[PDB]
Design an enzyme around this catalytic site. Sequence first.
Site, short mmCIF file in Angstrom:
data_model
loop_
_atom_site.label_atom_id
_atom_site.label_comp_id
_atom_site.label_asym_id
_atom_site.label_seq_id
_atom_site.Cartn_x
_atom_site.Cartn_y
_atom_site.Cartn_z
N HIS A 114 0.84 -1.20 0.00
CA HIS A 114 0.00 0.00 0.00
C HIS A 114 0.87 1.25 0.00
O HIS A 114 0.62 2.18 -0.77
CB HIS A 114 -0.92 -0.05 1.23
CG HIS A 114 -1.76 1.18 1.42
ND1 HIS A 114 -3.07 1.25 1.00
CD2 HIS A 114 -1.48 2.36 2.02
CE1 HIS A 114 -3.56 2.44 1.32
NE2 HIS A 114 -2.62 3.13 1.93
N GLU A 115 1.88 1.31 0.86
CA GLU A 115 2.71 2.50 0.96
C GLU A 115 3.52 2.73 -0.30
O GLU A 115 3.70 3.87 -0.73
CB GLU A 115 3.65 2.44 2.16
CG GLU A 115 2.98 2.42 3.51
CD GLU A 115 1.91 3.48 3.64
OE1 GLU A 115 2.15 4.63 3.22
OE2 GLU A 115 0.83 3.16 4.18
N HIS A 118 1.53 4.63 -2.71
CA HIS A 118 1.58 6.08 -2.49
C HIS A 118 2.89 6.64 -3.04
O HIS A 118 2.90 7.72 -3.64
CB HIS A 118 1.47 6.45 -1.01
CG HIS A 118 0.11 6.27 -0.42
ND1 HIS A 118 -1.03 6.79 -0.97
CD2 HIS A 118 -0.28 5.65 0.72
CE1 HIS A 118 -2.07 6.49 -0.21
NE2 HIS A 118 -1.64 5.80 0.82
N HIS A 124 -5.73 7.23 -2.44
CA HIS A 124 -6.61 6.19 -1.92
C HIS A 124 -7.75 5.87 -2.87
O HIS A 124 -8.35 6.77 -3.47
CB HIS A 124 -7.15 6.58 -0.55
CG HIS A 124 -6.15 6.46 0.54
ND1 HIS A 124 -6.16 7.25 1.67
CD2 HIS A 124 -5.11 5.61 0.70
CE1 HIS A 124 -5.17 6.91 2.46
NE2 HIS A 124 -4.51 5.91 1.90
C1 N73 Z 1 -6.73 6.41 8.15
C2 N73 Z 1 -5.71 6.48 7.01
C3 N73 Z 1 -6.15 7.55 6.00
O1 N73 Z 1 -4.40 6.77 7.51
N1 N73 Z 1 -3.41 6.08 7.10
C4 N73 Z 1 -2.37 6.81 6.55
C5 N73 Z 1 -2.15 6.19 5.16
O2 N73 Z 1 -3.03 6.18 4.36
N2 N73 Z 1 -0.87 5.63 4.79
O3 N73 Z 1 -0.73 5.19 3.71
C6 N73 Z 1 -2.70 8.31 6.31
C7 N73 Z 1 -2.52 9.19 7.56
C8 N73 Z 1 -1.79 8.90 5.23
S1 N73 Z 1 -3.03 4.96 8.01
O4 N73 Z 1 -1.65 5.07 8.50
O5 N73 Z 1 -3.98 4.89 9.12
C9 N73 Z 1 -3.15 3.47 6.93
C10 N73 Z 1 -4.44 2.91 6.65
C11 N73 Z 1 -4.57 1.75 5.78
C12 N73 Z 1 -3.38 1.18 5.22
C13 N73 Z 1 -3.47 -0.06 4.29
C14 N73 Z 1 -2.52 -1.03 4.40
C15 N73 Z 1 -2.62 -2.30 3.49
C16 N73 Z 1 -3.66 -2.45 2.64
C17 N73 Z 1 -4.76 -1.37 2.55
C18 N73 Z 1 -4.68 -0.25 3.35
C19 N73 Z 1 -2.09 1.74 5.49
C20 N73 Z 1 -1.97 2.91 6.36
ZN ZN Z 2 -2.70 5.11 2.52
#
Ligand code: N73
Ligand code: ZN
Length: 157
Positions: A114-115, A118, A124
């Site tokens: 996921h990261e 980004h 998202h």
């Molecule tokens: C609530 C969300 C929006 O926040 N996330 C961060 C994020 O999106 N990081 O990429 C934000 C602050 C940038 S996260 O760290 O909680 C988070 C939430 C879900 C996932 C994720 C992991 C694997 C598969 C799908 C979603 C990773 C981080």
């Molecule tokens: Zn994310």
Amino acid sequence: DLKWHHHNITYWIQNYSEDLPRAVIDDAFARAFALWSAVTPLTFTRVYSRDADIVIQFGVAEHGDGYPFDGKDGLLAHAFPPGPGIQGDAHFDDDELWSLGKGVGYSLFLVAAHEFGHALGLDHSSVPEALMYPMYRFTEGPPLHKDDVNGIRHLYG
Ligand SMILES: CC(C)ON([C@@H](C(=O)N=O)C(C)C)S(=O)(=O)c1ccc(-c2ccccc2)cc1
Ligand SMILES: [Zn+2]
Ligand SMILES: [Ca+2]
Ligand SMILES: [Ca+2]
Ligand SMILES: [Ca+2]
Ligand SMILES: [Zn+2]
């Protein structure tokens, strides 16, 4: 930036969580990258250099970039969109227990995949089965959805 302008992306694991053996962490990141390289013209090469496109860190709380983590659960990780310096980098909250996800903890493989999305410029997704959906849920099946691939092809062809 919206996307990387070169295809040969480099990454540096600046430090390690003690949650997992280093070889396991290395492999988790390699698998996460391989997920994206299969569906893009991009390659991902590990380097031992601060000059890497994607610098990977484990950290807790305020860890040097003004976007603090929050202790156990809540925020898991974050990554910056493509560009120089801090752009492209990926940080993981080490107040989490990093694991292979099936039991306790969060899958380092899935969260890194996921990261890394980004870090390539993806935002998202609105599709709950997509990797880029803003909520973590553990799965053992194929993480990429049509939306993820369409998103990444839109940026990279
Ligand atoms: C609530 C969300 C929006 O926040 N996330 C961060 C994020 O999106 N990081 O990429 C934000 C602050 C940038 S996260 O760290 O909680 C988070 C939430 C879900 C996932 C994720 C992991 C694997 C598969 C799908 C979603 C990773 C981080
Ligand atoms: Zn994310
Ligand atoms: Ca957290
Ligand atoms: Ca960078
Ligand atoms: Ca930890
Ligand atoms: Zn950070």
